[PDB]
């Protein structure tokens, strides 16, 4: 899960890492009152949304009057910010971070992720701060420096110095950088982070390192042992259907398309979306029916899939699982009536009682086709949305 920038900065502060003095505000009044708490302006005001590109989208501004802070806050609070990292609907702005302006001398990049190829937490630093790091990676590889945390020893100061020297830092900046590295590496391990990104990690005109932005991603699988991080989750930042699905043991991800997919298995779910796409269809969502295809769970799945008005048909592809095909068919039938599914549903069943389940669908009289095989199921749901 993602954290807000203000939350990443509180975490940084807890670990002695440096960030601008600032306040996360939920009302224009708090935002304007932050001005004097911070000190002499100007002040940076930032919409807090998980997505990046807030700057290009107008969500980050340097202002110099309490009046401007308040206006910015009035302008954004309760409103949604669209960036190239959100969908066209954007993320709600419920917090405005008001912080001290920083005198930037140089912009660096420091970040870490779990690298799956080397199977290590890898820190990456670059003099290319303020740019999307991926771009820099494509064009100027030689400018990205990396170190892998050794699981046996934990992060070591020499790794911090290695990156610092490769960035051409010298003097106290080397110790400062090392400190930031050791702290960030420590946070990464202790808080079970999946991602850290300080972009830009700034060298101030006064000559100090400061984290100007902060993007942290926690490993969702470790939340059971990260109580503080658990509380920081902000559901408003995501499609509410995801959490709904999750609480129902369903993995849901909305897409552009109009053919809803209900499948058991993540890989099969993606493969099913792909086969629908291959046959001229446009998948509306990814929905992995992770739990046992019970009547209730399948009903939820439909409620969730059909909460998106663009869906004109639902393809259900169940292969095995704990429930028998005939009981899954009763679940689909039941879900279709109860949810008042108003769209054609195409079903592909495999396993115990596949044909009895298919017969059950055929005999319900509901608008539900029991397909014969995957390709067939794909073609049929595709056909089913022709001209709708």
């Amino acid at each position: 899960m993602n954290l807000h920038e203000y939350q990443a900065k509180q975490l940084f502060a807890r670990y002695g890492l440096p960030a601008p003095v600032g306040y996360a505000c939920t009302t224009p009044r708090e935002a304007e009152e932050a001005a004097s708490k911070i000190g002499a302006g100007p002040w940076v005001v930032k919409c807090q949304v998980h997505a990046g590109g807030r700057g290009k989208a107008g969500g980050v501004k340097v202002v110099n009057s309490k009046e401007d802070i308040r206006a910015f806050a009035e302008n954004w609070l309760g409103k949604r910010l669209v960036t190239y990292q959100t969908d066209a609907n954007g993320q709600p702005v419920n917090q405005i971070l008001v912080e001290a302006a920083t005198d930037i001398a140089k912009e660096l990049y420091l970040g870490a992720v779990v690298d799956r190829s080397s199977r290590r937490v890898v820190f990456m630093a670059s003099t290319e701060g303020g740019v999307e790091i991926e771009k820099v990676a494509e064009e100027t590889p030689h400018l990205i420096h990396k170190v892998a945390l050794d699981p046996l020893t934990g992060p070591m100061p020499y790794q911090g110095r290695e990156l610092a020297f490769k960035l051409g830092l010298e003097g106290k900046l080397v110790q400062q950088f090392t400190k930031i590295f050791m702290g960030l590496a420590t946070i990464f391990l202790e808080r079970d982070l999946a991602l850290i990104e300080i972009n830009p990690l700034v060298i101030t005109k006064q000559g100090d390192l400061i984290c100007l932005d902060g993007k942290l991603g926690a490993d969702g699988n470790a939340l059971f042992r990260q109580p503080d991080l658990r509380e920081m989750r902000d559901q408003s930042q995501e499609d509410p259907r995801e959490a709904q699905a999750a609480q129902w043991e369903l993995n849901y991800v909305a897409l552009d398309g109009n053919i809803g997919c209900m499948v058991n298995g993540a890989g099969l779910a993606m493969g099913t979306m792909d086969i629908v796409k291959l046959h001229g269809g446009e998948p509306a969502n990814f929905l992995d029916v992770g739990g046992g295809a019970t009547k209730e769970r399948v009903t939820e799945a439909f409620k969730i899939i059909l909460s998106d008005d663009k869906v004109k048909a639902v393809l259900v592809n169940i292969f095995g699982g704990i429930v028998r095909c005939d009981l899954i068919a009763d679940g689909i039938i039941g879900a279709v009536a109860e949810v008042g599914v108003n769209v054609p549903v195409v079903v592909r069943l495999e396993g115990n009682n596949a044909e009895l389940g298919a017969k059950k669908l055929a005999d319900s009289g509901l608008n539900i086709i029991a397909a014969k095989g995957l390709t067939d199921a794909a073609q049929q749901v595709v056909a089913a949305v022709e001209g709708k």
């Binding site: 799956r116 490993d219 993995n251 897409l255 298995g265 993540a266 890989g267 291959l278 292969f319």
Partner: protein
């Protein structure tokens, strides 16, 4: 076949839990040589007619099992896996989903140093049709045969199983390496076993978005695999930077798209197939 066979003796960690109970009954019914289980606190009892041990070392001393299947909840997995490695188990099949990545990061280093083989986590397990079944895959769609299957996904594998059975090819061994970002074994590890297994005549490689295991496997296949390989990658239509169910099914930093993987495999000479329904057809081609 690879990894397991009719002779593999298996203990189950989390044996008395729901899934451990349920899938052990399934393994027993298949003829898998389950010889016992481990559940701290229930040593000395018996379950599914097998002994239950408080520790894996007690289990190993008592039964000689060399393989352990783990159905222990994620918070205790690292502990479970390390206990198994430490008790001398040489093959661990971890079914468990949700193991913290950092835990797998450490476990993977341990596994490699100790020379222990682990399939998983977050995988359906392993099955050598006719001889041994460890995990959750259904043994009722399998058929003893010549196709080796490796996959990051459970359900997709089943599709490939159905197709290779339907075409009469059959399976030598099916290995679900799991959907996590840091698995115990990756494609290359399994590919090398299939390449060196006389009974495996063709290989089906099933991958998906995220990471670069498929790309590395491609380069590996080109240079070290002579048997025909048919591949399929799920997620061509998956968005970037979004977990698609599997913790490891996420395209991070724009790298690891299904297309890049398909492309890398084609270059290495793997027979890729754009529709998962055509895996059987593609095998018929190269066989």
């Amino acid at each position: 076949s690879i990894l397991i066979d009719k002779n593999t003796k298996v203990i189950c960690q989390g044996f008395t839990g729901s899934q451990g109970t349920f899938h052990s009954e399934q393994a027993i019914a298949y003829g898998t040589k389950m010889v016992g289980g481990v559940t701290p606190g229930k040593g000395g009892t018996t379950h599914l007619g097998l002994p239950v041990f408080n520790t894996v070392r007690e289990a190993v001393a008592a039964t000689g099992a060399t393989a352990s299947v783990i159905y222990v909840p994620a918070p205790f997995c690292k502990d479970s896996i390390l206990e198994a490695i430490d008790a001398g188990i040489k093959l661990i099949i971890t079914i468990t989903e949700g193991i913290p990545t950092l835990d797998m990061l450490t476990v993977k280093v341990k596994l490699d140093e100790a020379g222990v083989r682990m399939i998983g986590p977050n995988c359906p397990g392993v099955i050598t049709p006719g001889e041994c079944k460890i995990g959750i895959q259904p043994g009722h769609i399998h058929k003893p045969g010549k196709v080796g299957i490796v996959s990051r996904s459970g359900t997709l594998t089943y599709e490939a199983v159905k197709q290779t059975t339907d075409y009469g090819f059959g399976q030598s061994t099916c290995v679900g390496i799991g959907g996590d970002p840091i698995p115990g074994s990756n494609f290359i590890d399994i590919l090398e076993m299939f390449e060196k297994d006389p009974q495996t005549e063709a290989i089906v490689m099933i991958g998906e978005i995220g990471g670069s295991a498929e790309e590395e496997a491609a380069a590996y296949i080109k240079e070290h695999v002579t048997k025909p390989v048919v591949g399929y990658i799920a997620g061509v239509t998956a968005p970037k930077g979004k977990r698609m169910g599997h913790a490891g099914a996420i395209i991070a930093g724009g790298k690891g798209t299904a297309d890049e993987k398909f492309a890398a495999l084609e270059a290495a000479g793997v027979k890729t197939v754009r529709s998962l329904a055509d895996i059987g057809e593609a095998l018929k081609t190269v066989l």
